[PDB]
Nucleic acid binder design. Structure first.
Ligand SMILES: [Cl-]
Ligand SMILES: [Cl-]
Ligand SMILES: [Mg+2]
Ligand SMILES: [Mg+2]
Ligand SMILES: [Mg+2]
Ligand SMILES: [Mg+2]
Ligand SMILES: [Mg+2]
Ligand SMILES: [Mg+2]
Ligand SMILES: [Mg+2]
Ligand SMILES: [Mg+2]
Ligand SMILES: [Mg+2]
Ligand SMILES: [Mg+2]
Ligand SMILES: [Mg+2]
Ligand SMILES: [Mg+2]
Ligand SMILES: [Mg+2]
Ligand SMILES: [Mg+2]
Ligand SMILES: [Mg+2]
Ligand SMILES: [Mg+2]
Ligand SMILES: [Mg+2]
Ligand SMILES: [Mg+2]
Ligand SMILES: [Mg+2]
Ligand SMILES: [Mg+2]
Ligand SMILES: [Mg+2]
Ligand SMILES: [Mg+2]
Ligand SMILES: [Mg+2]
Ligand SMILES: [Mg+2]
Lengths: 156, 197, 126, 61, 106
RNA sequence: GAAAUUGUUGAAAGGGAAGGGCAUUUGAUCAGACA
RNA sequence: GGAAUACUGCCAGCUGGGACUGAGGACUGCGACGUAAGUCAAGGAUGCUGGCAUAAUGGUUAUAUGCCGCCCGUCUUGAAA
RNA sequence: GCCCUGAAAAUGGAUGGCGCUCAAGCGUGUUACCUAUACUCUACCGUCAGGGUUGAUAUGAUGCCCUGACGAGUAGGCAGGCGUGGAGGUCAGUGACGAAGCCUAGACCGUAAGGUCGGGUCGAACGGCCUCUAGUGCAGAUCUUGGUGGUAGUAGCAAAUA
RNA sequence: UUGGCGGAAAGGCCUUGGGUGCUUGCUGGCGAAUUGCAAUGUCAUUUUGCGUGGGGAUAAAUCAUUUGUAUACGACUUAGA
């Protein structure tokens, strides 16, 4: 015998977990996040883009559109902590967004249906965008920080 | 904020300016000091001359080339005041000291650049009126600085060229200012006025 | 393969080396407690080496556990390997250093059939 | 820092088990350990402590 | 345009320290444009990245990053305290760091 | 066929010693799960 | 003559931002909200999602940087001496 | 009150240094801020104290578990452990298909004394556990014996005619 | 490309003429997706080496020998197609 066998062995059975008291409750967004608000993307592929906020999804994500015809940003999901809410608003009444949900963006080239509903959503948005002058040019440009810009004193 | 900050040493108190620059170098900002011969030190000229002679007599007894080195130039006097406020015997201190340049007068590389001032170290803003002060240029000459007249002659030549440049800049600014005022009273000007610009 | 365990924490991974074992060749690195009257190590002055003490003891739930989560048990033949038949999730077999090359082949084959983990299966491989 | 009014980590100073290695004596201690815990009878506690005593502390009767 | 910056420039000053002893686990960060503890409250919790270069390419890149965040203010002059996943090296005293705008409360 | 001590080869550092403690960068090198 | 405010104190008033921690492991206790069935922030963290599955994290080692570190043993009131 | 005279020592020199003059000096008042192995809360290790639990069919009642508090140390005391030569018992233990020894900025376990593994070298014996026993653990003693350095290719190898 | 100026470390500044690119001063039409909800997401300037071809230029020092204005040894100072 190279090593003396232990007289006691621990149990191989795995104990069950105690009952957890942590009930999931819906997220409350900050007051600046209202549908139709122009958002500035702070990270990701489309960082610095100015998009339009549409709907709040069930997985605590925000549904946004560029629109794709203006600045090339399609219907996507973003995180509320990675955007900046501006003071400008776009009317959303007349835009159908109840078809888009968490399962719509399942991961599993571009599909055909994604192209069609992009144009349907954007057409209503573009009509409302033309109401105010220089707003279309505003959405096409990208946000950036200049020399001397202090974010703690900037108003959006 | 600038990649290189050029400080005009005229009218600055030596000790207060040295503290400001030493912290800037340690924080990673390159500093250039010009016109070191126009620096000021509080106290009468005789007091500061006596202080330097006290510094002069300190030397290694068995070999004078080993002892403290007594640099007479105004730029090196300010450098001595600055090296004492930096841990110059460490690699961090050595790297900080390589971000600094001090010159007598304004050499050609920096005579066409912008010079700033440090209000914390300005003699006119710190010393009580009536208090006596000394100028570093004359103090250096009394302790053996040889190039006071050469710097004075070169600085006179620089000012003649600098004044001619300013005259043309003034004329162009008057032309630009008139056009901006003429461009006012327009719709674009009114919209800019409503937004603060 | 082992039972789930809490994250293993090592309070002091660095070896405790005897003072001045890097200064003289005759002083080995095996830990010895300084007992001199003036010793800076014994008096615990700032900037000196630290000394072993009971405060560094590891959590009893993760003590003696290898990073894979098993406890090492040295085996020398087939008979003592089979003592781990019902304890495959807590113990892993290690073959003794003096086991011949041909005997290691028999042990490894039996361990694979029983599902017993072996920590040194590449020893004496032709 | 604590200004202790008494010595720290002080043992009770009373035997909690027999010093001997007698297997049969340890069986009697095991029996009366159970009885003293679950009978609330002062007799059982006295007997259990008496089993821990050394030879000089158990004179013949 | 000519600018694409989405972060605030910062400088790594030193570790948390007394006169003679330093603490590498905490770094002191100076944020450009911040000169008041009240103003420094805006940047609490913001992510900080230190970006540097190496000769060897590892994961298809020759640029490496060390991540951290702002914990609390420091002093009366707008300095803040920061903690990084791995402690910043001491040679970066005076180097530049990037302070991002996320997580955002705007 | 150990150590002191020495040669060759390879790697690294060196502005009046060298060695050490805490932390991290860089280089080299390496175990553990892929259920 | 009639108020306000300052200063000090109280609230089993409301609410925003940041940091560190997640020990325990079937049930049992004390409470809360409910006509009830039940639910809950009430005797210790869960839910959702992404990238990578290898030297990426980490260990070891050499080096560099910041700060710190005087030679051990011995006698002694007192040792780097 | 502050300042000045009174006020002279030997290497060069020290409010710690730089330097500072409505101070970065002196007297006084009000706040903000910095940081100890101290204080508060949490985790983990150990120690002590008070308790729970023998019921078989699953293994340690010196076991397992619950609760609270505590932790500096020379001279010195006690306790639990690590390692070495030999002895009784046992593992029908390891081994010429390579035992012991040695080398190894390779891996793993332990707070530590140490233990285990891989690779290289090597050639004939050796180990785990329960106990017994001692000529049983070294950095020092101007320690004993043996071996080897820096000094150092240095001092020097110049009386007596060639 | 024209002309002028700058020696304190000038190595820069100003100016004439034409060619060509862009122009968000104003009005239009197309493209962007899938990096999947963030991951610096790579856009800088340091030095050196090996291969392309378009020009440019065809030496010295040291040892050995020799000198004594030099000299402990090195060094110094002279000479030699
Ligand atoms: Cl151990
Ligand atoms: Cl010669
Ligand atoms: Mg002279
Ligand atoms: Mg270890
Ligand atoms: Mg003592
Ligand atoms: Mg110890
Ligand atoms: Mg031999
Ligand atoms: Mg050797
Ligand atoms: Mg790493
Ligand atoms: Mg020191
Ligand atoms: Mg005495
Ligand atoms: Mg001593
Ligand atoms: Mg005061
Ligand atoms: Mg404390
Ligand atoms: Mg103690
Ligand atoms: Mg062998
Ligand atoms: Mg070795
Ligand atoms: Mg033989
Ligand atoms: Mg002996
Ligand atoms: Mg020893
Ligand atoms: Mg010895
Ligand atoms: Mg001793
Ligand atoms: Mg000796
Ligand atoms: Mg000789
Ligand atoms: Mg002789
Ligand atoms: Mg002779």
């Amino acid at each position: 015998s190279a090593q003396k066998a232990p007289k006691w062995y621990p149990s191989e059975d795995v104990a069950a977990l105690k009952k957890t008291r942590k009930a999931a409750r819906p997220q409350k967004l900050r007051a600046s996040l209202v549908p139709g608000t122009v958002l500035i993307l702070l990270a990701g592929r489309f960082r610095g883009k100015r998009v339009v906020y549409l709907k709040h999804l069930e997985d605590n994500t925000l549904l946004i559109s560029g629109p794709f015809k203006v600045n090339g940003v399609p219907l996507r999901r973003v995180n509320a902590r990675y955007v900046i809410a501006t003071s400008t608003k776009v009317s959303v009444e007349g835009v159908n967004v109840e078809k888009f949900n968490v399962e719509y963006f399942a991961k599993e080239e571009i599909k055909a249906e994604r192209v069609e509903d992009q144009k349907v959503v954007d057409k209503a948005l573009i009509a409302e965008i033309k109401k105010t002058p220089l707003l279309k040019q505003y959405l096409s440009a990208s946000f950036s920080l200049k020399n001397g810009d202090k974010p703690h004193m900037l108003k959006f | 904020v600038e990649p290189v900050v050029v400080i005009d040493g005229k009218g600055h108190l030596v000790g207060r300016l040295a503290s400001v620059v030493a912290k800037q170098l340690l924080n990673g900002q390159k500093i250039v000091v010009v016109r070191a011969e126009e620096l000021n030190i509080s106290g009468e000229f005789f007091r500061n001359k006596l202080k330097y002679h006290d510094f002069l007599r300190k030397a290694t007894a068995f070999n004078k080339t080993r002892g403290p080195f007594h640099f007479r130039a105004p730029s090196r006097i300010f450098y001595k005041a600055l090296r004492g406020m930096v841990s110059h015997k460490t690699a961090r201190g050595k790297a900080a000291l390589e971000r600094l340049k001090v010159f007598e007068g304004i050499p050609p590389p920096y005579d066409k650049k912008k010079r700033v001032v440090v209000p914390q170290a300005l003699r006119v803003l710190r010393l009580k009126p009536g208090r006596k002060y000394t100028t570093l240029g004359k103090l250096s000459t009394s302790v053996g600085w040889k190039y006071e007249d050469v710097v004075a002659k070169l600085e006179a030549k620089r000012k003649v060229s600098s004044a001619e440049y300013y005259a043309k800049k003034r004329a162009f600014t008057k032309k630009v200012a008139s056009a901006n005022a003429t461009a006012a009273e327009s719709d674009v000007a009114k919209q800019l006025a409503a937004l603060g610009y | 393969a082992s039972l789930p365990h809490p994250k293993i924490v090592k309070k002091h991974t660095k070896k405790f080396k005897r003072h001045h074992s890097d200064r003289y060749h005759r002083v080995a690195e095996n830990w010895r407690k300084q007992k001199g009257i003036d010793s800076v190590v014994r008096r615990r002055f700032r900037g000196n080496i630290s000394q072993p003490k009971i405060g560094y003891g590891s959590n009893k739930k993760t003590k003696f556990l290898s990073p894979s989560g098993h406890k090492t048990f040295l085996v020398a033949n087939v008979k003592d390997l089979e003592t781990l038949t019902m304890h495959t999730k807590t113990y892993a077999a290690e073959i003794a250093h003096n086991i011949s090359a041909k005997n290691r082949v028999v042990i490894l084959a039996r361990a694979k059939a029983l599902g017993i983990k072996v920590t040194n299966p590449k020893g004496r491989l032709a | 820092g604590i200004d202790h009014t008494s010595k720290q980590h002080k043992r009770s100073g009373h035997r909690t088990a027999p010093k001997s290695d007698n297997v049969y004596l340890k069986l009697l201690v095991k029996l009366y350990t159970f009885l003293a815990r679950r009978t609330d009878a002062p007799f059982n506690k006295v007997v259990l402590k008496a089993l821990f005593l050394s030879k000089i502390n158990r004179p013949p009767v | 345009a000519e600018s694409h910056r989405l972060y605030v420039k910062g400088k790594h000053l030193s570790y948390q320290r007394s006169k003679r002893v330093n603490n590498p686990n905490v770094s002191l960060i100076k944020i450009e444009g911040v000169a008041t503890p009240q103003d420094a409250q805006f940047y609490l919790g913001k992510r900080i990245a230190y970006v540097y270069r190496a000769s060897k390419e590892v994961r298809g890149s020759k640029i490496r990053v060390m991540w951290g965040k702002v914990t609390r203010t420091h002093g009366n002059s707008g300095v803040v305290r920061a903690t990084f996943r791995n402690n910043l090296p001491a040679k970066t005293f005076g180097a530049s760091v990037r302070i991002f705008l996320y997580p955002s409360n705007i």
